[PDB]
Amino acid sequence: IAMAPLLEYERQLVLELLDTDGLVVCARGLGADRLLYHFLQLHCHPACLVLVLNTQPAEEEYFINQLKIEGVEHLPRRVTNEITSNSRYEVYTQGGVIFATSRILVVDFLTDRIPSDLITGILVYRAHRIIESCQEAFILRLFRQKNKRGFIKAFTDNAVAFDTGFCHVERVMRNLFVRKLYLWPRFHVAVNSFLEQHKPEVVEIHVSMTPTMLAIQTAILDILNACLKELKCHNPSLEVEDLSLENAIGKPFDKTIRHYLDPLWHQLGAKTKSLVQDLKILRTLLQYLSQYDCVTFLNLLESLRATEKAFGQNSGWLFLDSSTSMFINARARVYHLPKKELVLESNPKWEALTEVLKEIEAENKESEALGGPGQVLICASDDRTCSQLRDYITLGAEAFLLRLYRKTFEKDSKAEEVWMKFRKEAAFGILKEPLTIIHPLLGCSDPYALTRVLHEVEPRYVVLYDAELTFVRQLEIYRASRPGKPLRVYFLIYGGSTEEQRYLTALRKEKEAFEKLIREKASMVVPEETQQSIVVDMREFRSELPSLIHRRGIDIEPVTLEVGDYILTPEMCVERKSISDLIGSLNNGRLYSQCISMSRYYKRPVLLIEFDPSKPFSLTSRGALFQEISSNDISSKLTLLTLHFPRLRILWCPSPHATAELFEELKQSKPQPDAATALAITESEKYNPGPQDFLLKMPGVNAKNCRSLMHHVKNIAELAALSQDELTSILGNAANAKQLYDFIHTSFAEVVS
């Protein structure tokens, strides 16, 4: 199989981890999942019980399939919410590796429906998530409080996560109860010594970018820099280090911008959200320019202008002098106006790939005496790029570009005939006697889809049309797993493009993060060191409040609540809202319905507001506070809500820690709540939840008509094909059937006019 025999340095790592347990940080793609699989194989016995924390269903299925291929008994079983609670305890008693989600583990630990004494240990995949995810930390704290004997091994890659200024390795180290840190970077002495013995033959081909695309990239970077500067100006608390033109190019830029702004999204302002949308649009523009052809780029560029004209999505930057040059350059790439003499400039990377394939074919034909032909695997960024490459290889540049142009632009046989005279002067498959396979690097539902192709076709040549650090390291591991068979990998890099900058930035950031971790490990050496209960909603466990409530010494009953978030007493409902959450709920009307339900079902409805004392929000508009009151002010909405709900009490807290003390002191002599009563406070298996919402929101339907409508038809698409008379007959009302038919059968341009 793929992961089975391990490496000598991996054996050293496994021995170190079988010693005093700790946290292991490996290089991106350097076989952390291999260590996880080794430990799963070790603990696949039925006399032991271990748990795996952060694994996706696809990865779990792949691991199960690999273990079955290896010929193992008592395969790991995955416990999901679809499994009944009574059947869950039977799974725990059977032992072995258990793949469990955070919610199920939290519920079982809190309700004691799990043999916590029999747990041999917990394996924590993706250990870098403890920084932001509060569920796994709570699970580990609960497990340690009951067992105090089982092991906790944490595996992770992406050492750049620890490099952020918001996190700190000691907090994660103390959260996992590990007390040991193992660092295995790429430049590790044991890793480097063994890998260089069986290094692959890497040939990098540099492709000169067309000067027309260089101007487009320069304009995009100028607009991106302007947008970043404007976003920084409006957010003084956003300077940090992740807000830079070098980091904005990379993929994880969106995650940082979300983490730094989502908790206070509704107190940002109209311009900041538009700036974030512009940032995303510009990143998409860069990806399109670097990945796809000229026709697709021009189509996307013209689509952006059309959306702005109707609505104004990107009106902030679509008319700057740098943006106009982009349109002119894209047009000149596609067609030149002297009546359209098309230019149809092809991407230079296609020619480089053609030359590489020709050289590979010539070498295969020449070296047929020494063994058989070598299979070639081509890797692109996504499936669209792979389809583009297949269409280019099969048809050539001429017909492929002509087909793309004719798909969108007007038909003109007079101009297209002059053009070629000037010019002529998920496992995709190509060829038969070799196995020329094209497979996307990213975007696949199965993260191990590429691994199966790599280990199934056994390539001799690998053509990296796009570069990914994880797959590069995986190729290094795969080559070292076959000491006899050689492998050559080709690199296609655009000269001075954003993709090469991204690759170099990722390498440099990983090196810097590992150096920082190595320095920190030295500094970490010395400092190595009447039962009250509250019903808690399931959605609240992605927060620190349930963990702090349990810490004070009061047990937690985790259920799903349709009214409120916390039930302190038999008659008390607390709705936890932050400042941004409160503003959002007061704007969209969600708080009004919640207050109605709380007042109708509980005697003492309570609204809890958690503000930030370091950076308080005024809750009223500056400047307008000197003028007359307005309905848009949040204070006005809160005043109206209090006026219409006089029995609703409000608690103000500055931190989750303070909220726990307030909750504890709010129930000193009052009775205790319980489950199965708050649940009762408040078909399912015969309707698909997907089309249900779309059908419900469609005009001309209601709860009285939806049941008849969805039973009568088979699909939403068939609903559009129904005529007006059929709609009137089934619906039984002329008004609503006409409304639905008009909603489905009407254009947007006519509405504009």
């Binding site: 649009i281 998409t284 189509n299 996307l300 689509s303 952006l304 999505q313 975007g443 969209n588 009307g589 969600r590 009004y592 003492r604 309570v606 005024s618 009223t620 506070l625 000197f626 009151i629 204070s635 909405k637 005043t639 109206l640 209090t642 006026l643 219409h644 006089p646 609703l648 009490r649 409000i650 608690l651 103000w652 807290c653 500055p654 931190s655 307030l662 002191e665 015969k686 309707y687 698909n688 939840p689 997907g690 089309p691 249900q692 779309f694 929101k697 969805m710 039973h711 939403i716 698409a717 068939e718 559009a720 909603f743 489905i744 059968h745 009407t746 254009s747 947007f748 341009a749 509405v751």
Partner: protein, 199 residues
Amino acid sequence: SNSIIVSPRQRGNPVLKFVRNVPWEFGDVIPDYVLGQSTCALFLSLRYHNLHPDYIHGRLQSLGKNFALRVLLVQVDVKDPQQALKELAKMCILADCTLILAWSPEEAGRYLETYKAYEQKPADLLMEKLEQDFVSRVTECLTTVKSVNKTDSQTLLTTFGSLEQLIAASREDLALCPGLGPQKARRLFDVLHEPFLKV
């Protein structure tokens, strides 16, 4: 009487000078402010709270159950209000009054104005709008998907003419929409036509 009745004991206050949008006058009333019938107010400052610990309790006990809505609005002027807020919230829960926090005298005056000005205002401001425009309705219909948002709907109606055209589009055609992406187009296509029954 479209004016706020102010208790005489608040003559030297800095907040009642910050109300400009509504008139007010003095009058002998139990609470500090009378914002119409069935609505009163008591002003507290955390400074005066931690130099006069028992002052607020006596006022809240003597206020009585005359007013339906009783608001205890406080001024958070201290730097560490965590301890005072807990006791104040417990007292408000025990005494059946509403706690409102203002961080400046400007905000307290605005709260007083809004409480006076909203004496007969309905609750239509709080409730959801649910615009009946065709563009708004189709945007709401498309928003129900997991990842589709307002801008995604806007570019969806710009590319495809009618909802019938969007329905007729194949899976690859939806994926080729500029700015959609593979996963959003895939999930929209799955939602677009999947049998209603089963699961």
